[PDB]
Amino acid sequence: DCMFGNGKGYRGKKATTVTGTPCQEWAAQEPHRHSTFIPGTNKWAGLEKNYCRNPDGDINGPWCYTMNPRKLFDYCDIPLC
Template sequence: MAFPTTYAHFCEILVLGILAVHVAAKECVDNVEGKDYTGTINTTKNGLKCKDWSNTGSNMTLDTQRLLADQHNYCRNPDSDPFGPWCYTTDDDTFWETCDIPFCVLDLQDAENRIQYC
């Protein structure tokens, strides 16, 4: 089963003679670990609401705290968990849980259509 790739914005922008591509948050992962996931999914695979990363009360390293400081309550994979993006939950019985993030699918026709409208 293929999942569509969802981008919030995709445009080519010419800046000072250098082609820059602006791609906003991806709502999908390229691999199982999903370390590059930057989307806005904020519920776990079982539908639990994610807790804000700045309000976890956990023993995160200082580097991890800085990395996640502006990540709201979105699913992330700061520790390279092999099961993919996860979050701390607001549920008292479940401290943390992985999130069900769809895999990205490369659709060249869709990408060409998006470029035409930029």
């Protein structure tokens, strides 16, 4: 699928970053601990499995926590609608 504007409403199944790195699941706390952007308390941003999302409305578009233990997050690569 494509993304509208900055992709805040994107609900597709892309689950890798721009470089191909697998995404970490939003509910997971490994390999990266995070107190923010958890599905338990954010019920409105579609924080589902390990899919690319944009809960903070970054102009750069949808992103995910990465499975690389050194690198916290990266943007994904989804075309503009």
